[model samples]
Target: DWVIPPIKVSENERGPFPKRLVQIKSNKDRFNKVYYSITGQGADNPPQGVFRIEWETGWMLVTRPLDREEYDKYVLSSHAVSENGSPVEEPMEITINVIDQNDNRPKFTQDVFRGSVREGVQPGTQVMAVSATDEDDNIDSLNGVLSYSILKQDPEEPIPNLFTINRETGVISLIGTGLDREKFPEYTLTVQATDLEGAGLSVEGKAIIQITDANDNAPIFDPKTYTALVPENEIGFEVQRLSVTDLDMPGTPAWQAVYKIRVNEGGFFNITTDPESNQGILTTAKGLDFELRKQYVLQITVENAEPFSVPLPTSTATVTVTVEDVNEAPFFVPAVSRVDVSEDLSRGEKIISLVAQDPDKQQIQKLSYFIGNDPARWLTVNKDNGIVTGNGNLDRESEYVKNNTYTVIMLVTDDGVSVGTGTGTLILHVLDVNDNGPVPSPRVFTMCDQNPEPQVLTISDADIPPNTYPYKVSLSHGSDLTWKAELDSKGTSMLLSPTQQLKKGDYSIYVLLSDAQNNPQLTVVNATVCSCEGKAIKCQ
Candidate 1:
């Protein structure tokens, strides 16, 4: 057997009765007869009636239109023989091929395609891609070449052609401007794919081009003006509720609002947004004082959590708050008062004038003064007037004085609604007074026998300054014959000396001691004469 070149025929070809495909001829056919026949695939196999051949003429033919999509090739057997029906030449094989034709149409992958794009996006922004397939021959022809376009748009708003598709890639993109969610939340598009480069065999599919929301609108205050009343000296109190409205989608960043206080004096007010209600709540950051300021005007602004896509005016609201008066306790101008007074101050004399005033000006209040603490019962305050007086003579040496300062507490009460009361501290500085006398020690003095050395005595005084030191010491006129007193330069000590030596006997000596104030006291000293044994002396 010998090999032959394969033959090719176009599929889907028109035929009258039979179409000749390829002929087989053996080398011995010049002197003998030749026969040809098809046996495999499309001939004697599963498709038995599609291809046929003549046994004596060595020709092959197709009985019907050949579909390349189903079967594309066929093989047949050929032989040469003598006139007596005996073999003269070896058998040979032939091949036939069916070419492709543009007979299939394009089909979309799905009935509907899904995609999303943000609102207010710029043109030429890619949304999603569309895909389709064709069953035609693309190697030899342009039958399978596909192009894409938007056939129609449902509910066309803002413009008719809102989107476009790429002819070669089938990518959808924005073409029109001004995509607002408030006007159109979503847009449905009909996308089409066509074979032969958009000229033949078209198929349509839906693309749900949903427009996601963006921050394109501003939040507006519902009530432009507001008035509120708050009690004086109140902090962290919810004063008012500010309402607002926005057209963007709910639960999104474009819809959530934020509040700010644009103009607030002393940072007394603050604002916060509520997530559930989308409302602004106004609160007091600091306590308000009715006496300092009676009213307040706050300027507030509202905006979304996200920035706006377009330039728009920011909405604002004004709140006027009035402070209501509260009954305040009486307060002293100076909480602590210092007064200087002499220790020997006369009884019932005024020490200091106490003053307390009520903070509430709306009503008159009567301030009554009283002594809150007087440990020594040395002070008294007038109830009608705020004058403090001494109850008794003051003593600088009193046990109640600390570091020369005496303390007293004054209480002032107002006749307001709640009977408000206030406390003040009064410090009295006690001056020193010389009212004490000097006292001498060693009332009995022991003198050695025949000795002239004076016996020293110490003086003490309880008073300070002019009542201390520089004391005078002497003997009485009648007692001066037996002894004499010698005073030191500072007059704080004295010495007792004998005028003459006396025999072994006890003598009584009288001495007088005086302070700087000339107050004197009499003291007695006992003199004894004794005998000494070595360094020891005995007095009897």
Candidate 2:
């Protein structure tokens, strides 16, 4: 028997069919006829099937239909058989290779893409760009062709048909009434990017467009102009009756309104806006008295209540209040009045004219006076004319006390609706006169050294009359006779103490100088004895 060896095909060849065919080399004596068969899990290996083969000249072509999705492997064999069911010794092996082709349609990365469009944005504003991809390699094939458009929109209201998409760029923009978040917070549009010309084709994509808010519109005060009167004393009192208006969509920054006092001066007032009614209320923080200040000028400003990245436009209004002054209680010009009187005045001398004025108008103005607690029965005040005069002898040394302020609560009344009374304190300062002679300003005597006491320094007055006296000096210690006082040529009384051992420290003695009368005018003087250092020190 003439047997043919098995022919082998390569696995690396590309094809719908194997690139190189396998065959037996034929000689002149016998012709080579090739038949093919395939064996795998699907075939009867039991279930082996016949492989399709084509022969031309000395070459044999072998192939088998493959369903890649159902079966992963296949084996092909070529056999030389006799005319009557006789098999050749060996079969040839051939492998087929399959390559990939562009078949799948383009798909979108996401089912629905979300983006924003600012309100008031122009028609050409680039809303957003959408894209899809194709798995096929053919650039101009049906798989690569993609077109985008808005299929449908929800809640179509203010300026309905809103957006349109650019077919080439896949960019969407405002077509009708742009986007208003005020009316609709977000716009749900069915964006379709299809690979086929019409919606009929299977390749498709979708996205959603959300419209964001912008402060394009400003908050406005209703009525535009507002007016109110704040009481003079009610500087910070809240005045009601003010409102605002906004044309923007609700819940937006532009629609929210706030109140503020833009101008506050001269104790006027502060203003605040109501969130619900958008009304502004002027409040009084301090009491207002028209008697002190008569009028107030205030400027109020209103703005958006919503906090915004940028400041919104503000509306301002001016407020004026006229204050009216009412009748106030009468008060004394000088709450406390002071007067000085000389002690040498005779009995019954007029001292001062005490008077008060009523702040009320002419018809209601009235004033009255009276003496209060006169100790010596010497002072009296004229009731009708408001004058204080002496009723008895004015003895300052006997009755005039130091810090002699007298509480004379003078009665003042006004003829207004109700009677009003005010009080006045009279400070009667009885001034010192030269009636009492000058005693030793410093009565004690001391010498720098212990040798002997020096001559005494004399004391005199600058305002008192000169010369005329038995200048009397009275000592007030244990032995009044220990020192004798005599008037020197300078008209000052000098006291000479017996020569005694004196130290460098201080010594004090009290002396009294009095005028020679039954009721002598007495004056007290402090006498200090010291060394030379004491002479440089001054008494306060």
Candidate 3:
């Protein structure tokens, strides 16, 4: 069993015509006159004449230069025949491999490649990898051992070598430290792959490396200062507009700005950013007082929506607001004035005085004091002095003195640019006084001459407590001889008893009643003698 190994021949060899590649011999060739011939693809088939075998000699020859790209390997059959055209040996299957040469160039898989990386990235950062292929053999001659490199970089800033690639891996990475999306948005790199470890055939492809936006630049104020005018005692009014500038990509998170109020301890002002214009709007949160605080200062800070990719300084703006004053209404020092006076205060006496002044600091105002509301007409105010005087005697039991307090409203009108009025409540706490004396319920009473029982009377007073109960009742001095009056245990009533039963005639009776304060009043009663009748007494 003489087994022949497969033969190999270098492809695309510029050899002389009819070059011998290998020889095939059989054991019967030494004893008989045997002939050898070849047939199959590349020898007698479609691509004929590429390989041939000699009839007299057992040698295989290539007729023309072989191109491995067209046919990398070939299979043929050899025949060893005797003189009578009978086979002396079986057909031998021969295989021939077309050896590879560094003839074909490397090819890239794509014409244009795309890659992206963020701005302000460090060098040696991986971007993407490129793929290429070679048509030559790599195991034997290393013809397909491709090396990748960047040939050219377009629009280079700082330096031209902005990117690098792995010689065998075709991986693209960052090289220089000047990747700024604001200045240069994208970079065009011409990449190439070479066979035989970068010394053989090569091909070029393009890579458009896009530099994405990042927060590299901080936001800065354009003018950095502002001035505004605000009206005094006003709120919800816009004060000023502030603007900023940035170098990052527009309409992105890196470029959008956010505002902050740095120094606003009084909470008088508020700041917000405009989404369309990217301007800060400052508004008044509370009303301002021109006389107390004429001016205010504010500090405003600006930043981006995204954090800064690099270390940078923040920017701020200063604002100065001035307030303008206007005519103000007159105000009282104490809005409500209080005083205590007895209910029996005399008329034409001076009571508590009310004070008011105008708040217009710049101009002089003429203020006149007048009674705004006085229900009982019990008080009067001086037109110029604001001195309140009692117009009449005050009574605690009057209809106007509710809950023992009499209220009066005093008004001060200002004769200024605008006629303004301010009101003050004058509260007079009326104290209790025993100004009223006790009186009998019935001022006149009738009595029977023959009756022996005493006539009782209810005593009442119009004065307040502590001055009405325990009444002292008695008959007058002139009538004491005929009639007598005695107070009950509680002193709330009195018993009028006749010393003796009087005869039938008209008589005049006089009585006196006093309160706990000893204030007394005189009263009268008439007596008549009637004929004895049933439930009917005649009086004349």
User: Best candidate, TM-score-wise?
Assistant: 1
lDDT (Cα, tens digit) per residue for candidate 3, span 1-540 = 768888888877885687887877777766668888878998888798888888887888888887887889888888988876789877888888887888889899988889999887888899988999898888887698888888788996668888899887889888778877878888898988888888888889999988888887888887877898878774678988887888787888777888878777678778788876588888988877678776677788888887878789988898888888767778767856477877667788887776787877776667788778868676777988888888786678667667777777778888746687887776778888777787766544446544545667777776788787676666765565478777778667777777865666566677777777565756666555554422224355
Model 3 lDDT-worst window of ten: 529-538
lDDT per residue, candidate 1, 1-540, as tens digits? 335788888888885969776666656777655555556667678778777778777777878877888877777655566676777655556677888887888888887889888887898888888888898777777788888888778877678887888899998888878887788877788888887898888888888877788877889888999999888775679999988888888888888988888877887777788887689898988878777786777788888888888899998998888877788788766756477778878888888876877877766668778778767687787888888887787778758777878777778887846687777877778888876667767766555664546677778776777667576666776454567667777656776666766656576766666766566656556656565422224446
Whole-model alpha-carbon lDDT for candidate 3: 0.78
In the predicted model 1, the residue pairs found to clash are none
- TM-score of each prediction: 0.83, 0.57, 0.80
* C-alpha lDDT of all candidate models, in order: 0.76, 0.55, 0.78
The TM-score, computed over Cα atoms with residue i paired to residue i, of candidate 2 is 0.57
Worst 10 residues of 2 by lDDT: 517-526
Q: lDDT tens digits, residues 18-119, model 2? A: 433444542321644533343332333432432343433334443444433233344555555544545554654444443223344567767767888777
The C-alpha stretches of model 2 lying farther than 4 A from their native spots are 1-36, 40-109, 131-140, 154-161, 175-178, 195-206, 222-241, 247-267, 271-289, 292-329, 335-350, 358-394, 398-540
Error of 2 at 138 (Å): 5.2
